[PDB]
Request: fold
Amino acid sequence: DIQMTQSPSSLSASVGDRVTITCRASQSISSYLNWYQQKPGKAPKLLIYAASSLQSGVPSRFSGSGSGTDFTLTISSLQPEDFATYYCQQSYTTPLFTFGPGTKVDIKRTVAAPSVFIFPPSDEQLKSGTASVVCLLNNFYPREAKVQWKVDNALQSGNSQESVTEQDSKDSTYSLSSTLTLSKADYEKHKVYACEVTHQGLSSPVTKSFNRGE
Amino acid sequence: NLCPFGEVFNATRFASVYAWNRKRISNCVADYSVLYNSASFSTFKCYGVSPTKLNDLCFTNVYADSFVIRGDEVRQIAPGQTGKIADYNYKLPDDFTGCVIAWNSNNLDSKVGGNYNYLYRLFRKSNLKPFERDISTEIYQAGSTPCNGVEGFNCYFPLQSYGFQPTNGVGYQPYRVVVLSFELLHAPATVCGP
Amino acid sequence: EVQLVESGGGLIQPGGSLRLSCAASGLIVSSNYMSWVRQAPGKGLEWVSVLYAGGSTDYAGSVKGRFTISRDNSKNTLYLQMNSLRAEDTAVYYCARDAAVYGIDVWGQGTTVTVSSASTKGPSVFPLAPSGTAALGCLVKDYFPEPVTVSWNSGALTSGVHTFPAVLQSSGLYSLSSVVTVPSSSLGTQTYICNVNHKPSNTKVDKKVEPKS
Ligand SMILES: *[C@@H]1O[C@H](CO)[C@@H](O)[C@H](O)[C@H]1NC(C)=O
Reply:
């Protein structure tokens, strides 16, 4: 088989910048590689077929390059409709093709530390038997952030779930929501619930927390 | 007189699978011991015939078809197989009585830079009949509007190239292949072993 | 009219079956390699099965034996029969024509296929009470299936509002929360109510959010 990999998983770029995505292959594919673009909730769109051949109906700023195992899509002047995900596909073993993971291109901005808020379970959700604790990371950039949960200074592992929003059209910021789930049993047996947040815009980690009685 | 298998295995230049070469052997003696005495080949299945029990038989005609394909397509040169090569390039009948020989040729068929002399038909409307050979280079028409000799939307050039690179995996390296077909109709059987 | 119009995807439990339909126009499926590609949520493009012009078909190990690609030349439609479904098959399915070295130029609009053994239940709306600026919101928990719309004060609140995409929990039920950042000097005066609407379960829910003490 043939493995396909893309240079930067994520990428921040300004409108009018020259972007360069890279794609690599397990073997010498010799220019049998196509490039696609995909905006959330739409289908793929072909951009460059056979390494550098532009696809009619696609803007002139899309360049295709590379010939053996290392390949490169280039956008000359990124425009507002160019923020999307770009994957590469392989035509070497057609009709069984494999794809790359994709490279998400987003709106470069100034680093913004997130406002950190921690919500304790509502007494209404305690009647039901389970307890959900929520930690919010609000309005930051870039998207990469880490959120560690502590219950009486015991880092939690298999009981959290995260969710990130889309780049805000006004902010160009992200927001995050980690939900720790528990049981009226466990939540009732421990006092201090806490949420450590590390992120490029915070000097050191930020820990929002609370105590059950409170 | 010995059957000229040497000018088929020792051929310096083999052919693209789409235009697979065919030698028709007749009126001679063939030692199938020398072919399978030497273990120079990677693949040698014999269908409907035993190689050691082949020197005692006779056939009115023996056919030596030769071509070069990707190393991982050699499994497609067997009865009732499907794929690009078996479907659109070289088809073995379900009731096949013959042998299939193959050896890796990453020394001669994969040049520094990549070899593009070997094409395979990658676009066809329907499957080859067994031992059919299709050489058409017409623009393949995937649409309901004629192409008329030019590539573009719905218009695909049907032959494509193997990019034979010597540094690639073995599945993607050139294998030379020889398919010995043994036939016998009501006519003098002149191709005998010893 | 170059377009691939699919349909036939929906909600089905495991061991279940479904027939997806790629109606073609602008090309002839019969003389083209036609693949089925699926993309699981936030996952990426994965090939499913093809069908050549000679009628030869081919599938991936996960569906080999459970899926079945075919076509009705007269109607110029391509179909995918999905039998004995599993929960790893929940993804958006795309029908495409592969142009080999020319690329997969014509893609379908996509049809979603959710395979879950879960009784569609309405969500619970628990509140997230606030503690220079304050935040708050609703925890729309344990609903099925997607999706659920959220608004605040029936549309009088849209600034500082954040309604996250849903997660899929361990129980096979979804749970997303919605938050809003308002001035902390409004807690003792402005009324903040969240509007949760699950159509599939015909559930409309409003829930005043306010502090405790
Ligand atoms: C090709 O040449 C070698 C000597 O280099 C000879 O022994 C060999 O048998 C020839 N091929 C065949 C199939 O006889």
Remarks:
- The first helix of chain B runs from residue 6 to 9.
- Chain B touches chain A through eleven residues (CB under 8 Å).
